[PDB]
Amino acid sequence: HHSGLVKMSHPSGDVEACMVQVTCGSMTLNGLWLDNTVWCPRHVMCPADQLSDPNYDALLISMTNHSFSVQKHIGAPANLRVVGHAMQGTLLKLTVDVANPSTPAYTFTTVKPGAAFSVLACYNGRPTGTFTVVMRPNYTIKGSFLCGSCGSVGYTKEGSVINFCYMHQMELANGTHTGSAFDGTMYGAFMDKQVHQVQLTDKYCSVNVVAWLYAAILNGCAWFVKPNRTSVVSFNEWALANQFTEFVGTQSVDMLAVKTGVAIEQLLYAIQQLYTGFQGKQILGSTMLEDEFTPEDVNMQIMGVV
Amino acid sequence: HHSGLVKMSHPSGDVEACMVQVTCGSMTLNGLWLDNTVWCPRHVMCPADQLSDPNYDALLISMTNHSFSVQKHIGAPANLRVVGHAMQGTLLKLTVDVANPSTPAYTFTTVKPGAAFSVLACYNGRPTGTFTVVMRPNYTIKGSFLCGSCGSVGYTKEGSVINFCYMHQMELANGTHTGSAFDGTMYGAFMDKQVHQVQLTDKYCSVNVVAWLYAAILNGCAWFVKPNRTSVVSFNEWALANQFTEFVGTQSVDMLAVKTGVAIEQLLYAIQQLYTGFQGKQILGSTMLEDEFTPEDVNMQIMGVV
Ligand SMILES: *[C@H](O)[C@H](C[C@@H]1CCNC1=O)NC(=O)[C@H](CC(C)C)NC(=O)OCC(C)(C)[S@](=O)c1ccccc1
Ligand SMILES: *[C@H](O)[C@H](C[C@@H]1CCNC1=O)NC(=O)[C@H](CC(C)C)NC(=O)OCC(C)(C)[S@](=O)c1ccccc1
């Protein structure tokens, strides 16, 4: 029995129309063209045998507007003339002389651990695929990015408004990925330089495991639901010792509780038991806890509620 | 060590520009607008009280061009005038007075069990999400579709050409989904009416399990590799006895064998052993075989090879 859950990304067309290629001398990567601004990772400025210890302030000083070439390859091709350049945290803001005619309604936001967003993977300014990820508690994502992908963007959508939340920067030793918010900060404690980096411990996202257990009930799978309950406060003390995030309820979770008639506290107890072992049983085809679906995923994909 | 594998869909913008809403009487769903043709499921023609045993030839004869209402909602909205109608298998072909100005280069193709394709899920002619699935051996997909999703489309891409392969029609009792190819045949033995239907046994897709074991080896996870080999002929006899598809090697699998230095027959042996149990161990974070990634997925996402 299929749960009805897939990894569901937003349609990417609106964001595709904003991707460009940014070249600075010998270096190239992707950028995001919104209004008269092109955003891209600042390490496009850095020579290859220097990424280990760059001085981004000096590199920026050494650049002129003609140092940056910006090209739109898809749709109607364009070459964009740069008329200003500036740095914000780990991003460059290049000002161009033409406003993107396809600029969507947009905002910038930061995504939080456990929340899902859509990524448009791009190479040389050309979109190549789209996928969705949850931001991990250690501020990495389990993505799919190769050489040339930097500047690929992540986003959520609220109505027609695109909320850009991620610009890809790097791959860690363990194969996971991280990047910047559009305020220029790196997610977590990461730094955009070519050095091995202390990468922190991941955790199970409790609110997402609860959502997934609700998805199981909505599919008629509820062998793990007992009358026993664990309070949110007690679960959260337990979570601290057992590699779970602390549970914070939301209206989205509340709607799942009302729909199923199963209280959050019943599922907090269930998680504590399932963490010790599934004892030969399965839930939605799995023998381990699933934390990659959000409460909003379950409400949208199974009940059609946004 | 995250494998670097995600469910990767194609960028959806080219297909978004082809989706329309099709309404017939009080029935509504999605259609695909290419050149002067709108494709949609023929059951839009059926009253809801009659979906169990529709007389589609008689329904078609009763329609006029004015029976159909076609709207483009996204981008530049338009109301399309139907100027001819025809039935092909389980699809309607509506001829409209306007050629879609955003028609991409396209073909129609049929997808085979084990192959992946991208789906653009739509409601009321408006794209809402994109995801990727593999066609199962029983000609269903494990999708995410609600009421109103019919006419959502699936496709692959070669270069800039979109190969349309799927139009969504129905959800089965076990939560899986099926639909039509654009020659109007249903996938599998399914029929487009509201009657509960014999849905056949699924199988593990051996070629995809082989791909996933190669992904593990590429990631440094090769504890299951031994000198022991099972020939394709011998594996295929075993596959028929153990709910696996028969293995047919491809050039894509061959390049994984070259890159890892592990022969196909070593992994066929590994699958036989792993199927009897992982013995408490994991592969790429899993305690069961994974068959939802293709050889092409592994070549593309891990080695950057289209
Ligand atoms: C930009 O396109 C690129 C994206 C990477 C390339 C491989 N996959 C990706 O997602 N970013 C970088 O290569 C990045 C540039 C820095 C200046 C930000 N470096 C990077 O990701 O290097 C990996 C590290 C940071 C050295 S990580 O600590 C590591 C150590 C040892 C082995 C592997 C990885
Ligand atoms: C078209 O929008 C719609 C899509 C469905 C609705 C729910 N999720 C979907 O994917 N298709 C239909 O409703 C379809 C119309 C027929 C004329 C093809 N019927 C449908 O999906 O019915 C399900 C059956 C055929 C009754 S299946 O045998 C079943 C039996 C028992 C429980 C559930 C499903």
Side-chain angles (χ1 to χ4, degrees), chain A residues 1-51 53-306, chain B:
Chain A
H1 198 269
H2 173 51
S3 64
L5 288 176
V6 302
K7 293 310 186 61
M8 181 83 76
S9 299
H10 291 291
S12 58
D14 284 359
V15 176
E16 288 168 54
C18 300
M19 308 303 300
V20 293
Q21 179 176 21
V22 181
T23 306
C24 179
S26 80
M27 293 285 276
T28 197
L29 41 60
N30 309 281
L32 183 72
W33 180 25
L34 302 171
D35 302 319
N36 287 88
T37 307
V38 176
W39 304 80
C40 72
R42 68 179 173 171
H43 70 255
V44 72
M45 270 189 324
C46 192
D49 44 14
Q50 255 210 36
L51 290 163
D53 195 23
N55 190 315
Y56 284 115
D57 301 310
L59 290 163
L60 183 75
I61 294 158
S62 77
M63 282 333 135
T64 73
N65 289 327
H66 294 61
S67 302
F68 300 97
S69 167
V70 181
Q71 307 169 86
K72 174 181 171 101
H73 299 298
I74 71 200
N79 194 291
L80 304 182
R81 187 169 75 101
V82 175
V83 300
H85 63 266
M87 180 154 86
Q88 170 141 4
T90 59
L91 296 183
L92 291 183
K93 302 172 63 183
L94 311 173
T95 304
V96 293
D97 69 335
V98 173
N100 183 351
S102 293
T103 300
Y106 75 95
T107 71
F108 298 133
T109 191
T110 48
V111 69
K112 294 176 184 308
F117 60 101
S118 293
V119 174
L120 186 62
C122 297
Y123 297 84
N124 300 309
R126 319 185 146 71
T128 59
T130 190
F131 58 94
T132 181
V133 291
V134 149
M135 173 83 51
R136 301 304 308 170
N138 69 356
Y139 291 105
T140 66
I141 57 170
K142 308 181 174 178
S144 184
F145 297 105
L146 297 173
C147 283
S149 61
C150 282
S152 296
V153 296
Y155 50 94
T156 64
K157 288 198 64 213
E158 270 180 76
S160 84
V161 186
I162 295 160
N163 318 303
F164 293 105
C165 60
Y166 178 91
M167 181 150 277
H168 182 59
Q169 296 263 12
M170 63 195 252
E171 179 171 307
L172 294 324
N174 73 346
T176 65
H177 301 102
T178 196
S180 320
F182 282 85
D183 65 2
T185 67
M186 295 287 292
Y187 279 100
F190 298 107
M191 299 181 333
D192 60 335
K193 40 167 262 163
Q194 194 70 48
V195 302
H196 201 106
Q197 284 184 50
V198 166
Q199 171 234 318
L200 297 199
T201 294
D202 202 356
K203 309 206 262 183
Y204 280 114
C205 299
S206 301
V207 65
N208 288 355
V209 181
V210 165
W212 173 74
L213 289 179
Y214 275 127
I217 299 160
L218 292 160
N219 278 265
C221 181
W223 62 264
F224 50 85
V225 182
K226 302 286 73 153
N228 309 63
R229 298 169 173 231
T230 297
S231 69
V232 170
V233 174
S234 306
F235 179 84
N236 282 351
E237 302 160 0
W238 176 90
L240 287 187
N242 290 285
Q243 334 160 287
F244 280 76
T245 61
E246 293 170 277
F247 178 89
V248 178
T250 70
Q251 299 162 216
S252 190
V253 181
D254 287 348
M255 307 173 234
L256 299 172
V258 172
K259 190 31 199 153
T260 62
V262 177
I264 287 167
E265 290 80 4
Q266 288 176 273
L267 297 186
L268 296 186
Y269 182 87
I271 288 171
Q272 294 178 312
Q273 318 305 127
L274 291 166
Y275 182 71
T276 75
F278 280 39
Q279 294 159 60
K281 295 142 208 153
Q282 284 172 67
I283 299 173
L284 296 184
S286 179
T287 58
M288 40 203 142
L289 298 175
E290 178 53 91
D291 75 349
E292 292 183 349
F293 295 103
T294 69
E296 301 76 14
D297 282 319
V298 176
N299 275 289
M300 285 186 291
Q301 290 192 43
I302 295 174
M303 293 140 42
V305 169
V306 201
Chain B
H1 186 267
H2 170 57
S3 60
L5 280 180
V6 302
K7 293 304 180 63
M8 180 84 73
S9 297
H10 294 290
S12 57
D14 284 9
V15 178
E16 291 172 50
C18 300
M19 308 297 314
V20 295
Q21 181 174 18
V22 179
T23 298
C24 188
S26 86
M27 285 279 318
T28 198
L29 39 58
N30 312 279
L32 180 73
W33 179 27
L34 307 165
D35 305 318
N36 288 90
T37 301
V38 175
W39 298 95
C40 71
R42 65 183 177 167
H43 73 253
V44 76
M45 266 197 314
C46 201
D49 322 68
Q50 280 261 312
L51 285 167
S52 72
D53 193 21
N55 186 340
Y56 284 115
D57 309 306
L59 283 169
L60 182 67
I61 272 157
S62 84
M63 284 336 150
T64 71
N65 295 330
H66 309 293
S67 303
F68 301 97
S69 169
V70 185
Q71 279 96 56
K72 183 119 199 74
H73 293 301
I74 73 102
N79 183 31
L80 304 174
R81 200 169 91 62
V82 175
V83 293
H85 57 282
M87 170 145 95
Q88 177 158 359
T90 60
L91 299 181
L92 294 182
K93 281 182 73 163
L94 305 180
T95 306
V96 292
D97 58 334
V98 190
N100 186 352
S102 297
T103 303
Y106 76 93
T107 73
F108 298 145
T109 192
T110 50
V111 69
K112 277 154 198 319
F117 61 101
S118 295
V119 172
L120 183 60
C122 302
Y123 295 87
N124 305 303
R126 290 153 181 100
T128 60
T130 191
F131 62 90
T132 179
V133 289
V134 294
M135 182 60 77
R136 300 309 304 170
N138 66 357
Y139 293 101
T140 67
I141 56 170
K142 296 181 193 199
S144 179
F145 296 106
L146 302 172
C147 280
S149 43
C150 282
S152 293
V153 301
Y155 61 99
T156 64
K157 302 191 37 133
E158 307 185 74
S160 64
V161 184
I162 304 267
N163 308 318
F164 291 107
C165 61
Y166 178 90
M167 195 156 260
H168 183 56
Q169 297 259 10
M170 61 203 308
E171 180 171 307
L172 294 321
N174 70 346
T176 65
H177 301 99
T178 195
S180 311
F182 282 85
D183 62 3
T185 66
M186 296 291 294
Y187 280 98
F190 298 102
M191 298 177 321
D192 61 334
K193 61 222 154 53
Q194 193 88 19
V195 85
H196 295 28
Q197 282 172 55
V198 173
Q199 155 243 326
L200 307 204
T201 309
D202 204 2
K203 292 174 169 355
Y204 289 102
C205 295
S206 301
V207 163
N208 290 355
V209 176
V210 167
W212 172 75
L213 291 178
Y214 275 125
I217 294 159
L218 289 164
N219 271 277
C221 182
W223 67 259
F224 50 84
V225 177
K226 318 225 150 50
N228 307 61
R229 297 172 173 233
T230 299
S231 67
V232 172
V233 180
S234 180
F235 177 84
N236 284 347
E237 292 176 287
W238 176 95
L240 304 174
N242 285 273
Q243 300 261 258
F244 281 70
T245 60
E246 289 163 282
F247 176 90
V248 181
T250 68
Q251 296 190 174
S252 182
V253 179
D254 290 337
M255 326 154 54
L256 296 175
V258 171
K259 274 23 199 173
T260 63
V262 175
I264 286 158
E265 291 80 359
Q266 287 175 273
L267 297 191
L268 299 182
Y269 179 89
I271 288 170
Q272 296 177 306
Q273 312 310 131
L274 289 168
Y275 178 69
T276 73
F278 281 35
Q279 279 213 354
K281 296 178 194 222
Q282 282 161 199
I283 298 172
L284 288 186
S286 177
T287 56
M288 32 186 111
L289 298 174
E290 169 76 74
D291 76 348
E292 309 184 338
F293 295 101
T294 67
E296 292 80 5
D297 287 329
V298 177
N299 273 116
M300 279 195 18
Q301 292 191 44
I302 297 186
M303 299 153 44
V305 177
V306 158

